[PDB]
């Protein structure tokens, strides 16, 4: 009974997350086919993704539970199709802002994909099905990155034809979406946990770490373009992305397997990994070596998954499955608020309008400051 919805959802997720053009977005946007400047991409286009994601988050959550999930998933597929159609044939800065708005809509709709299985799968089968869907998405992204690198290097394909493959993949995923069973119920519509201090503390770090991680991810490719202009040197954005994703997945798997009291060792290890994230970001900033910037990105992505995995394990240790949804929804909303404030102040043209050559000094400082403040309260 659980096999059919699970297999269909896993097929949709795999084909939606398989996007060979995602590692080479900056080389594509700044290439001859779009002629977008680095300042325009970083301080006018890219910030719009955070704004739309923050604005659309809560309404999409409320719509999802009430419409029984499936319709939102189909909407996510439609948004994927529109986003890549615009990416393939769009032109100018305004069109890219529309693309960013639709991508933010796509991201805000990902809650339906993971919340869908609750209403169609028995509570006894929740763990394995959720693990299956997460692993399928991770494998899809890694395979897409590896294929993107293989085609660019060996096959010699252009960045235009990488977006054609992504459009075909998302179209197939949408075609898979129209066959999922309609959920017959929902957790809230169709059926005070923060009072605990531990939940508040762990939620805070998760929210702040997630904000920093998403801010760094949105601009890491622009930093690589700055250090190694794509138009004159060989680039390995697919291989680097694939290796970083695999390292993060291995770190997340390792966290679960090794058994240790995270009530006592949680804060020390967390602070250490925040310091490691700060050091990797500082290396990315200062280092003039493109290989060192790749290594720093790998270290940051692997260490963050070491961090967020422990944070999520500590948050959900006592929460109910019903409470997972709203607690984590609030936590991602607050992380989006923090990221929006950061983007407005730093990256936005209405703030400091800082180029990518200085942003990563602010992100390393951000992570170091996170670790420093969290370290306090020890004595006195």
């Amino acid at each position, epitope marked *: 009974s659980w096999i059919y919805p699970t297999v269909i959802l896993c097929l949709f997720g795999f084909f939606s997350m398989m996007r060979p053009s995602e590692p080479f977005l900056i080389p594509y946007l700044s290439g001859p086919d779009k*002629n977008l*400047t*680095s*300042a*325009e991409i970083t301080n006018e286009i890219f910030p719009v993704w955070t704004y739309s994601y923050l604005v659309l988050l809560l309404p999409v959550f409320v719509l999802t539970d009430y419409v029984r999930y499936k319709p939102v998933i189909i909407l996510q597929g439609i948004s994927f199709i529109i986003t890549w159609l615009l990416l393939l044939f769009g*032109q*100018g*800065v*305004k069109t890219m802002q529309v693309v960013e708005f639709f991508y933010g809509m796509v991201t805000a709709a990902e809650v339906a994909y993971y919340a869908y299985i609750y209403s169609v799968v028995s509570p006894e089968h929740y763990q394995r099905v959720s693990g299956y869907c997460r692993s399928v998405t991770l494998a899809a992204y890694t395979a897409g990155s590896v294929l993107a690198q293989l085609l660019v290097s060996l096959a010699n394909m252009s960045y235009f034809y990488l977006n054609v493959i992504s459009l075909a993949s998302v179209s197939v995923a949408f075609l898979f979406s129209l066959f999922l069973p309609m959920p017959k119920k929902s957790m809230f519509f169709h059926a005070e946990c923060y009072s605990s201090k531990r939940l508040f503390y762990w939620s805070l770090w998760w929210a702040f770490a997630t904000a920093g991680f998403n801010q760094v991810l949105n601009y890491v490719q622009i930093l690589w373009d700055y250090k190694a202009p794509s138009q004159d040197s060989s680039i390995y954005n697919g291989a680097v992305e694939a290796i970083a994703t695999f390292g993060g997945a291995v770190a997340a798997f390792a966290v679960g397997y090794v058994k240790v009291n995270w009530d006592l060792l949680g804060e020390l290890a967390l602070v250490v990994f925040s310091v490691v994230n700060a050091g990797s970001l500082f290396l990315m900033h200062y280092t003039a070596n493109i290989w060192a910037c790749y290594a720093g990105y790998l270290i940051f992505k692997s260490s963050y998954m070491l961090l967020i995995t422990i944070a999520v394990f500590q948050i959900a240790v006592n929460l109910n499955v019903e409470r997972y949804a709203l607690v984590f929804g609030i936590n991602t909303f607050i992380a989006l608020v923090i990221q929006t404030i950061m983007t407005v102040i730093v990256v936005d*043209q*209405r*703030g*400091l*309008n800082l*180029p990518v*050559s200085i942003q990563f000094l602010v992100y390393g400082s951000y992570f170091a400051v996170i670790a420093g403040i969290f370290l306090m309260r020890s004595m006195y």
Partner: nanobody
Framework: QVQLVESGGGLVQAGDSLRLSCAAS????????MAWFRQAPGKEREFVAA????????YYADSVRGRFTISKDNAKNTVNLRMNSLKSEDTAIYYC???????????????????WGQGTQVTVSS
């Protein structure tokens, strides 16, 4: 007082190219936004391209994107604009403007620039 002066505009056959140079003076210019605007008869003043002198960041309007490139020859305190594959829709008077670098600077809004040139005309004949 800052003083912007342009040169290079002229009568150019449609499809050809043209270069425009705006030499700022009266001050040491390292923390200024230097931009180009244009105005044709019966229309409003339109952004063309801008450059950040400190960081070298460049901005373009989608109308001229891919054809116009804005650079900086600091050796003479001049910001240059090269125009390629000109069309009849590019006929206008071009004004280079200078804005001080500061917090919350709208690069493409003409009201942001407090110094403006006398305007050099570029008429494109087909």
């Amino acid at each position: 007082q800052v003083q912007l002066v342009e040169s290079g505009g002229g009568l150019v056959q449609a499809g050809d190219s043209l270069r425009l140079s705006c030499a700022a003076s009266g001050r040491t210019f390292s923390n200024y936004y230097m931009a180009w605007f244009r105005q044709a008869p019966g229309k409003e003043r339109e952004f063309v391209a801008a450059i950040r002198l400190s960081y070298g960041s460049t901005y373009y309007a989608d109308s001229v994107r891919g054809r116009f490139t804005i650079s900086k020859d600091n050796a003479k305190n001049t910001v240059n604009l090269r125009m390629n594959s000109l069309k009849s829709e590019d006929t206008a008077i071009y004004y280079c403007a200078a804005a001080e670098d500061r917090w919350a600077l709208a690069v493409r809004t003409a009201t942001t620039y407090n110094y403006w040139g006398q305007g050099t005309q570029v008429t494109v004949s087909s």
